[PDB]
Paper text:
Sclerotium rolfsii lectin (SRL) is a cell wall-associated developmental–stage specific lectin secreted from the soil–born pathogenic fungus. SRL displays a clear specificity for TF and its substituted glycan structures. In the current study we report two recombinant variants SSR1 and [name], generated by the deliberate changes of the amino acids incorporated at particular sites of SRL by the synthetic gene construct method based on the complete amino acid sequence of SRL. Interestingly, SSR1 and [name] the two different variants of SRL, differ in their glycan specificity.
In case of [name] amino acids at the 1st, 14th, 34th, 113th and 123rd were replaced with Val, Asp, Ser, Gln and Gln, respectively. The crystal structures of SSR1 and [name] lectins in their free form were determined at 1.7 Å and 1.6 Å resolution, respectively. Like SRL there are two protein molecules (named mol A and mol B) in the crystallographic asymmetric unit of both variants related by a non-crystallographic two-fold symmetry. The mutations of SSR1 (N14D, E113Q, E123Q) and [name] (T1V, N14D, T34S, E113Q, E123Q) were all identified and all atoms of the mutated residues were well defined within the electron density map. A bound MPD molecule was found in both variants at the same place like in SRL while in the [name] structure two additional molecules form the crystallization medium were found bound (MPD and a 2-amino-2-hydroxymethyl-propane-1,3 diol). In the structure of [name] the mutated residues Val1 and Ser34 are located in strands S1 and S2, respectively. In the [name] structure the T1V mutation leads to a shift of the residue by 0.6–1.0 Å (depending on the atoms) while the T34S mutation does not cause any conformational change on this residue. The adoption of this conformation of Asn81 in SSR1 is made possible by a shift of the entire loop encompassing residues 81–86 by 3.0 Å on average, from their positions in the SRL structure. This shift is less profound in the [name] structure (1.0 Å on average) and does not lead to a change in the conformation of the side chain of Asn81 which maintains a similar conformation to that of the SRL structure. The carbohydrate binding property of [name] remains unaltered compared to SRL.
Numbering used by the authors:
A (entry chain A), B (entry chain B): 0 to 141
Amino acid sequence: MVYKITVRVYQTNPDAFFHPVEKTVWKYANGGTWSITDDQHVLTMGGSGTSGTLRFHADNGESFTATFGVHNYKRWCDIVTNLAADETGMVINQQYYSQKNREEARERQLSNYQVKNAKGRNFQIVYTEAEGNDLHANLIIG
Amino acid sequence: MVYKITVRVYQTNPDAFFHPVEKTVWKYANGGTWSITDDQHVLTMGGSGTSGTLRFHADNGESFTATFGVHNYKRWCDIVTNLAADETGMVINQQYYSQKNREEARERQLSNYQVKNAKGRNFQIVYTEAEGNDLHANLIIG
């Protein structure tokens, strides 16, 4: 059955402004689509076992990836900060199915995750609808 | 050596409606960003030698990828209409730097390319500004 993850982005700090610069979809479970409905990023997936990655960028150099997916019928999420120049969104998205620490993050099936970058800025994902096929999550930027 | 490719999408046939469902950026040349300015898709790249893939999807089931980038200081593009169910945009984008047939398609440095899918719908990419670091291309859907 189709899984959908609707993401709302909350920027709370005026000292920086992030905007999406990359939207990727993993190939498993017949892939999926990244779309927009009323300023909401909607990830529609063909089933459980795949994911999608949003990469954001602020004009001050700061950047992070926010990956949302469904592993064994349960939602998961992870945030990667301090990205290298050759660490684009498609690079990160694939790592959750090849790189050990990333695979463990997905297998944790978190309804919420929190991490900071080197500058101290906090990034959080919180699933407000954390069960079923219609998932909703807030992306909160500190 | 920063390159920018501005893409304008033209849909000419009311029997279908396509919309972007994936925007990827290849990791080479310090990667880059996919952005939006006045309904135009803007691919900014840190240098020559990388690319970005836009995957489009119609509600009838039709899909294709339009990849734009710079190879050897000249613009290039390619359209893939025979998307496998496990071939998302990030899959296609990487193949231009791993699969020989896609490598050759990139190294041809096309500023103009036309191709159809199995249903007979035509897809076209034309660079109206095919010179310099500020490149401009039309994506015309038949």
